[PDB]
Amino acid sequence: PLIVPYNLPLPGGVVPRMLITILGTVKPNANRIALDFQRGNDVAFHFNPRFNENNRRVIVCNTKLDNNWGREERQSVFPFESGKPFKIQVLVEPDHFKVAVNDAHLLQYNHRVKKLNEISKLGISGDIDLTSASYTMI
Numbered sequence: 181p182l183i184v185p186y187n188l189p190l191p192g193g194v195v196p197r198m199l200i201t202i203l204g205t206v207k208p209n210a211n212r213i214a215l216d217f218q219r220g221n222d223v224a225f226h227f228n229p230r231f232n233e234n235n236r237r238v239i240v241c242n243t244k245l246d247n248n249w250g251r252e253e254r255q256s257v258f259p260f261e262s263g264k265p266f267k268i269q270v271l272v273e274p275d276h277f278k279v280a281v282n283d284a285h286l287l288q289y290n291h292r293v294k295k296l297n298e299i300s301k302l303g304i305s306g307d308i309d310l311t312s313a314s315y316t317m318i
């Protein structure tokens with residue numbers, strides 16, 4: 181285990197074919213998880229599983245620019261479960277991030293922040309026991 185909140189540096193930002201893998205276990209009674217791919221203070225890609233938003237589960241994705249959240253993209257397919265180990269894989273592609281959880285495709289999120297080579301940190305927060313966070317080029 182690693183202790184959250186956790187910052188993974190992404191030196192020189194991200195690039196297509198970079199596969200970022202986050203392993204952990206959802207806590208009991210979890211309420212929220214967040215991945216924040218950041219360009220300085222801007223959040224190029226916020227990936228935010230919510231376990232209880234109006235008594236249902238949803239994945240909220242967004243971008244934050246100049247400290248203002250933009251338009252949300254929401255996905256009801258929700259592959260996480262309280263108490264269970266997960267693998268989130270974020271595959272950087274030329275026009276989008278592609279997210280697969282537990283080896284099943286979940287969603288794609290088109291790049292709003294264009295300067296991929298400046299998206300130099302991944303923040304990991306929320307109701308998890310973090311196991312590892314790493315990346316490789318496929």
Ligand SMILES: O=c1oc2ccc(F)c(F)c2cc1CO[C@H]1[C@@H](O)[C@@H](CO)O[C@@H](S[C@@H]2O[C@H](CO)[C@H](O)[C@H](n3cc(-c4cc(F)c(F)c(F)c4)nn3)[C@H]2O)[C@@H]1O
Pocket residue numbers: 212213214226228240241242249250252254305306307
């Ligand atoms: O209004 C509606 O009405 C409906 C009605 C019906 C329906 F079907 C709908 F879909 C809707 C949908 C809407 C839209 O909802 C909006 C709107 O209300 C808005 C007003 O300002 O506020 C946000 S909340 C805001 O969203 C951000 C992403 O956009 C971040 O996630 C923030 N955020 C989380 C974290 C964080 C920090 C941590 F440390 C963690 F560990 C962690 F996991 C997360 N930090 N920041 C979050 O605070 C709402 O989602």
